[PDB]
Design a protein around this ligand. Structure first.
Ligand SMILES: C[C@@H]1O[C@@H](Oc2ccc([N+](=O)[O-])cc2)[C@@H](O)[C@H](O)[C@@H]1O
Ligand SMILES: C[C@@H]1O[C@@H](Oc2ccc([N+](=O)[O-])cc2)[C@@H](O)[C@H](O)[C@@H]1O
Ligand SMILES: C[C@@H]1O[C@@H](Oc2ccc([N+](=O)[O-])cc2)[C@@H](O)[C@H](O)[C@@H]1O
Ligand SMILES: C[C@@H]1O[C@@H](Oc2ccc([N+](=O)[O-])cc2)[C@@H](O)[C@H](O)[C@@H]1O
Lengths: 411, 411, 407, 407
C-alpha cells in the first residue's frame, strides 16, 4: 500500500554498504565483546585509551576503498558497548578520542572523506553501554547521556546519512524514550535514515526507517502494516565469526558465499552491509582487503542492476536458485550454480545446453545477454503461461562470477 | 604389508607443500590452459616470451612464505603444457627463460632459496607439450626431448627433492618409456621423490614413489598390492577454480574449507599441496597471501601432529566428522564443528557440555588438552570396549580454529 | 501452572486414531473433492442416497484402535461437505437419518469406544459448504453450528472431546467462542476441547501443531491455563480415501513421527480414511499392524513418558523421555547386526551420549529384548554414554528404546 | 553388439516378482537366521518336519504377479540353508518330498506361471550351509550343485531362467562355470542365466547391480556378447519374512526404484517373503496393490521403454524413455493442485526442460488422465520445455509419465 518516503527510496538505491568496527577492543584482536565476555578488569581494559594513537587510520583511504568496492555508504562504530567515543563529545565524557594520544576527531575525518567520494556517512551507536555507571545505577540519567551523545553527532558534522542503533535488546522491558531520542534526531537531521537492530516487536517507533534482518531470511522482507509508513530492510555479513578484528578466528566465509549473500539481499528487497574490523591503529587488515577486491570485481560487473534492481513476482523453475531483478528499463536474470566451459576433450562441466526457466515474464523479448562479456543467449517464450527459458552458457575458461547476470531487452 | 622406503617415509613427514603455477600464461590471467582452451594462434601466444621479465619474482620471498605457512616443500612448474621452460635448457630449446628479457635461471634461484629455508625443491614437468611438433609428429623423438629436459634438471641444480610429472593421461595407450626416464632420474638423483599424476589397480612404473588423489577421497588411500613397494599419496587444492592466476575467477573456497582439506589429507594418509598462481611478473598475488597467513596460523598451532601424525584404526561416534592421528608418543583428537563460547546471557553456541566419542583407544589416559590454549579436557573411558568420550569445549571468544586438536597423554 | 486433571489424562492418551468418513468417501478422490473439483452442489449432495454404511462396524474400528495402541478416536461427525453422521433431530435433512443407512453412527461409535475403554472424540468442521447460512448470514450460521454441537453434547452421554476445524477460513470474524465452548462446558464439563486454529479462547484445552515442529511445544503464558498440544499424520497426501494417491509415507516415518510427538510433548493422531461404505481399507490395516508392533514394545514409555531437559550428543537425533520411575533413551539410526563376514552395519561399538543425567545408574536395557547395555557416566558434567548395540538380525524397530534403572 | 533374442525378450519383461520362501520362513527372523543367529544345525534342520506348505497356492501367487504387472517370477528353489523346494530324485533327503508337504512345489509353480503367461525363474544358492561337501570337499560340492541344477533343467519343461547367488562367498575358487553353464545350455538353450555378483563367464546373460546405480549400466566390451542388467528391492531390510522388521520403505520409494531401473536400462525385481506355510503376507499385498496401480498406468512404456541420450534440466530428477513410436517424459517431485485460496503446491506453471529432443512435436499428454501439456521447443539446441501440471486433487502417481507424439 504505502510507498517509501524519498529518503528511504534513496536508501534502497544504496544497495551495498561497508560496516566498520573499530574501538579500543581492536588493540587486543580477540573480538569487540572482549571486555564483557573475557571478564576483564574494567580499569585495566580502559587503559587502552592511552595507546589509541589512530596512527594508521586514513579516512581518505577507507572512503576510496568503499567507493572501489561499489559501496554507497559506510557505517562506522562511533561508540560500541565498551563505551569509548571516536569523536569529540564536547565535555560529555573524558573517555573519547580527544583524551587519547590520537587527539583527532575521527568522525570529522570520516564524514569529510565520505563526502569527497559521494558516500553517505552513517553512525553506529551502541545503546547498551559498559563504561558509564549511569547505565545500571540511574537508567533515566543514562537516557539523557545517550541522547546527548547522539545530539553531538547531529549538530557538529553537517548532514548525516543515518544512524545505526544497536542494543535496546539488552533491556527489552525498559522505557527507552524513543519518541524523544528519534524526535531530536528528526529535529536536527530531518533527512537522516534511522536504522534499528531491534526495530521490530510492528515497529518499535514511527521514526524508524530501516529494520535489520538475518542474512538467511528466505523471503522478501516485511515493509510495515498497510496504510502505515513503509520501512526498508538491511542484512549484514561479517567475514569470519567476529565483528571487531579477531586474529585467531580462521573461520572465514568463502568469497563466493559473500557474493551470493549480496545478491540475496537484493532478491529479498534489502540492503546489505559487509563488515570489516580495523586493526588497533585503524588500518584495513590484509584479509579484509582481499575480500573487498573480490567483491569489487563482482559489483563493478553488476552495477546496472545492483542499485536500482528490485524484487518482482517472477519465479525460477524447480530445483534452481536463480531469481530476477527489475529496473524500469530491464529485467535481469541472476543465475547461480554455473560451471566453467572447457573445449573438446577437456570437460569442465559448463559445456552442454543448460535450460534455465522463469515464470512470470509476459512481454516479448528482443535480446538477452550476459553482463560480464555481452554474449547473446538463446531463449524461448510461452507468453500465455509467462514462461521464459534461456540456455545459460557456462563461464569462459579463466573466469567464474559465482552469480552471473543476464540483461533482458524487451521489444 | 610392506612399509615405506626411507625417502618415502621422509616424504610423508613433509605433510604440507606449496604448489606454484607460473608461466607465460600468467601474463594473461585467464588460466594456465588458455592457449589450448581459448583456441589461440600459437605464434601470437608465444610472443608472451618477449614480455617475460620476471621483474617481481623473488625466490627468497617465496621460500620465506612457504616456511611461514608451515610447508616443507615447494612444487614449481618448470615447464607447463605451453612448453616454455623456466630454466636454462642448455641448447635443447630456444623457448626458455634464457631467451626472455628475464635472462636468469629461475630454477637456480628457486633451488638456492629452498635450501636456505630447509625446504625440499620439487620440479613439476608437463609431459603433454603443446610447443614442440615432436609431440604429434615423432613421439619417440619427443620422449628423447622430454627425457633430456628432465636430465638437465637432474644434473645442474644439486640434489633435488622430487619430480612431479603431469600429462601421460593425454595418451593413455602409448609407451612412455618410463623405465628409461625414471631410471635416468635414479641414476643422477637416487633420493628424489617421483610423483605421478596418473601413476595408478597397478602403479604405472616401479620407480614411482607417490600417486595423486582427489581431495574428496573419503577413506585412507591405497599404498600398493601387498608384496609390492609402498607408494605414498598426495592431494591438491587450488584456491579458486584455476591453477594459474585467473583475475575474474571470484569463486574462491573458504579459508575454513582449506583448513579442513589439510586436516583431511592427513587423516587419509596423504600429503597436501596448496596451490598459488603467480602474477605475470612472478609476484605472489595479495589474495594468495591472505590464504597463506590464515593457513599459517593453523599449521603453527597443529605443528606437534601435522608432520608425524598418521592414520590409526580409531573411529569417531555417529554423526561427527572427528578423527584421530597417531604419533609415537601421542594420539591427537581432531575435532570439527565446534562453536564459540559466550558468557551468561550471551550465547554463541559452544557453551553446553559437548561429548565427542571415539572407538579404538584401549590404553588408560592421563591427560587431554587443546593445543591452542592448553585447556585440560574432562573425559571418561571404557577400556573393554575401547571407548573414549571427551567434553570438547568450544572456542574462547575471539578465536575459531575450524579444526581443533586435543593431545592425549597416556599413563 | 499444573494441567487440569482432564488435560493430564489427555496427555497420557499419547496416541489416537483419526477417522475420515463422509459422502466424499464414495468418490475416493479426497475429502475436499466438492470444492476443489468444482462439483455441482446438487449432484454431489445426491451421494446421500447411496450412503448405506453397509460395511461400517464401529466395533471393528474400536478393535483396530485398541490393537494399534491408541487410547482415543477422533471421528469426522461433519466435514466441510456439511453432511452429518448423526441424528440432528430436525436441525438438518442432510444427515444419516435421511440416508439409506438410517442409523445414528455416532451412537454406534460412542458405544464401541466405551466397550474398549477408548475415549470417543467428535471432529466438527466449522467451515461448512452445505448451508447457505455460512456465506449469506454468518451470525445465523453460528447458531446452526452451535446447535449441531449441542446435539452432540446432549444425546450421547459423557464424551471424550471435540476437535474443531476451520475457523482459519475467516481469521477476522467473531466466532462467538465463549458461547460455543460455554455451552460445551455446561453439558460436558470433562470433555477435551481441541482446536485446529496466545490461545483463541480460555476454554480450549489442546492446540494443534505441524508434525515437523522441532522443539517442545508451547503450554501457555505463566500464571495462565496450561494447554496441551497434538500433531497429526495421514498415510498418503489425503485425509479421506484417495484410490490413486500412491504417495504413502514409509511405516518407518510413521514410527518416527509417533516418537517425535512424544519428544516435543504432544499427542499424535494417525489418520485413516474409510471406504464409501465405511470399511477400513487394507492399506490402512498394514500400517496399523506395523505401528501396533512398535507401540506394544514402547508401552512402558509411550503413555507416561514426558520431555525432560536432557539433550543428545552432536549429530544424533536421539532423545530422552521421563516417567516418575525411569528415564528412557529413544535411539534412532541403528543398523542390523550380522556375524563374522556378514556385515550389515550395526556391529561396531556405537557410543551414544546424552547431557543432563546427574544420578548414578544401576542398569540400562533395550525394551525389545532385555539386552543389558554398557555405559559410562560423568556425574559432574551430567554425561551418559551407552554402547547402543544394533538390532538382532531379523528385526528393526526404527526407534529403539532403552530403559534406565537408577540406583 | 545386438542382444540375443532371449536377452531382448528379457529386457522387455521389465518387472519381476522375487519370492523368498524356505525353512527359515517358519521363524520369521530373516533368511540368514541359521548362520547369523549361530543356530544348532541339527535343531534348525528339524524345521523340515513342520514344512507343510499348507497355505502355498502357486495359482494365487501367479495371479498376484500378473495383477502387479510382473512378467516373470524368481522363486528360491534352494537358499543357503540348502533345503530344496523340489524333488531332487535321490540327490538329497533334505527336500520337500521328505517333508509333510510331499508335493513338488517347483512343479506347481511352473504350471501356475505358464497359465498366466509368466516366465518361471529358479533362484539357486551356490553357497550352501547344509552339505559338508561345501567346506570339506569343494570339487565334489561342484558336482552336487551341478546335479541339483540338472534336475531343474530336465524335469519341468522350458525354464525362463536361473538366478545364481553366492559365488561371492569364495571369490578366488574355480567354480567350473563352463561346465555348469554349458550343461544348462545343452538342456535349456533358451534359459536366461542371471548371476548375482569383465563378466565371469561367456554364458551369463544378465548381471545384477546395486539399486542406487546412478548411470546407465554396462552391457559388455564392444565385439563381445551383450549382457543385460537387473536390480532388486526388498520391502524392509530382509528378503525372507521378518515379523519385527518394521523398517519398510515407502511405496513411493518402491515406485521410484521401478522407474529408476528402466532409466538405467535394467529390469527390476520386487521381493516378497512368504510366511512359513507359503502365504503372501498382508503387508506385501498392500505394496503389490499400490505398485499395480502404477504399473497399469505406466504399461505403454514400462516394457518397451529404453534409455536414450536425453537429459533433464539442472536440479530435477526427470528422465526420458524411448520406444520406437514415442518418447515418454518421466517426471518426479510433482505436487497436488488445490483451488483458489487452497494451495497444495502444484498450481503454478511448472517448466520442466530436457536436452536432446531434436524433432518437432505434435502433442504431449499425461498417461494418467490424458491432459494435454503445453510446451516450447528450440530445435537447434534440442531443448524441450513442458508445463508439467500438478496432480488432480485426490491423486498422486509419484512418477508421472507424459507421452510425446511426434509430427
Ligand atoms: C553489528 C553487531 O550489532 C550488535 O550485535 C548484537 C547485539 C546484541 C546481541 N544480543 O544481545 O544478543 C546480539 C548481537 C553488536 O552487539 C555486535 O557487536 C555487532 O556490532
Ligand atoms: C595440477 C594440475 O595438473 C593437471 O591437471 C589436469 C590435467 C589433466 C586433466 N584432464 O586431462 O582432464 C585435468 C586436470 C594440469 O593439467 C593442470 O594445469 C594443473 O597443473
Ligand atoms: C485433519 C484435517 O483437518 C483440516 O486440515 C487442515 C485445516 C486447515 C489448514 N490450514 O488452515 O492450513 C490445513 C489443514 C481439514 O481441512 C482436512 O480436511 C483434515 O480433516
Ligand atoms: C537375493 C539375495 O541374494 C543374496 O544377496 C546378496 C548376496 C551377496 C552380497 N554380497 O556379497 O555383497 C550381497 C547381497 C543373499 O545374501 C540374500 O539372502 C538374498 O537371497
Amino acid at each position: 500500500m504505502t510507498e517509501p518516503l524519498p529518503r528511504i527510496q534513496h536508501y534502497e538505491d544504496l544497495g551495498l554498504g561497508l560496516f566498520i568496527h573499530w574501538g579500543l577492543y581492536s588493540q587486543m584482536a580477540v573480538g569487540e565483546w572482549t571486555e564483557l565476555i573475557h571478564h576483564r578488569n574494567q580499569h585495566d581494559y580502559e587503559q587502552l585509551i592511552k595507546t589509541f594513537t589512530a596512527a594508521q587510520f586514513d579516512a581518505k583511504k577507507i572512503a576510496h576503498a568503499a567507493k572501489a568496492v561499489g559501496a554507497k555508504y559506510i557505517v562506522l562504530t562511533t561508540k560500541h558497548h565498551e563505551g569509548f567515543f571516536l569523536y569529540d563529545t564536547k565535555g560529555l565524557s573524558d573517555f573519547d578520542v580527544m583524551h587519547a594520544p590520537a587527539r583527532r576527531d575521527l568522525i570529522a575525518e570520516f564524514v569529510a572523506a565520505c563526502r569527497e567520494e559521494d558516500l553517505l556517512p552513517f553512525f553506529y551507536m551502541a545503546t547498551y553501554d559498559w563504561h558509564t555507571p549511569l547505565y545500571d545505577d540511574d537508567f533515566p540519567a543514562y537516557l539523557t547521556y545517550l541522547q546527548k551523545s547522539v545530539e553531538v553527532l547531529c549538530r557538529n558534522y553537517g548532514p548525516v546519512g543515518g544512524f545505526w542503533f544497536d542494543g535496546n535488546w539488552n533491556k527489552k522491558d525498559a522505557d527507552w524514550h524513543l519518541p524523544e531520542l528519534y524526535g531530536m534526531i528528526r529535529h536536527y537531521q530531518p533527512n537522516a535514515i534511522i536504522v534499528s537492530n531491534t526495530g521490530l516487536k510492528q515497529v518499535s517507533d514511527p521514526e524508524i526507517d530501516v529494520v535489520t534482518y538475518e542474512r538467511r531470511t528466505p523471503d522478501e522482507i516485511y515493509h510495515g502494516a498497510p496504510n502505515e509508513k513503509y520501512v526498508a530492510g538491511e542484512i549484514s555479513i561479517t567475514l569470519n565469526q567476529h565483528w571487531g578484528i579477531a586474529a585467531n578466528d580462521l573461520n572465514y566465509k568463502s568469497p563466493a558465499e559473500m557474493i551470493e549473500t549480496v545478491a540475496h539481499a537484493r532478491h529479498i528487497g534489502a540492503n546489505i552491509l559487509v563488515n570489516i574490523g580495523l586493526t588497533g591503529t585503524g588500518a584495513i587488515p590484509a584479509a579484509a582487503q582481499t575480500y573487498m577486491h573480490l567483491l569489487g570485481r563482482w559489483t563493478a560487473m553488476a552495477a546496472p542492476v545492483l542499485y536500482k534492481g528490485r524484487p518482482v513476482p517472477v519465479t525460477s523453475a524447480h530445483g534452481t536458485r536463480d531469481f530476477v531483478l527489475h529496473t524500469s528499463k530491464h529485467d535481469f536474470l541472476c543465475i547461480l550454480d554455473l560451471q566453467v566451459v572447457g573445449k573438446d576433450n577437456v570437460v569442465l562441466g559448463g559445456e552442454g545446453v543448460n535450460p534455465r526457466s522463469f515464470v512470470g515474464i509476459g512481454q516479448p523479448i528482443q535480446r538477452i545477454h550476459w553482463l560480464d562479456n555481452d554474449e547473446v543467449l538463446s531463449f524461448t517464450q510461452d507468453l500465455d503461461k509467462k514462461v521464459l527459458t534461456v540456455d545459460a552458457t557456462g563461464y569462459p575458461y579463466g573466469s567464474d562470477w559465482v552469480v552471473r547476470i543476464a540483461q533482458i531487452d524487451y521489444e
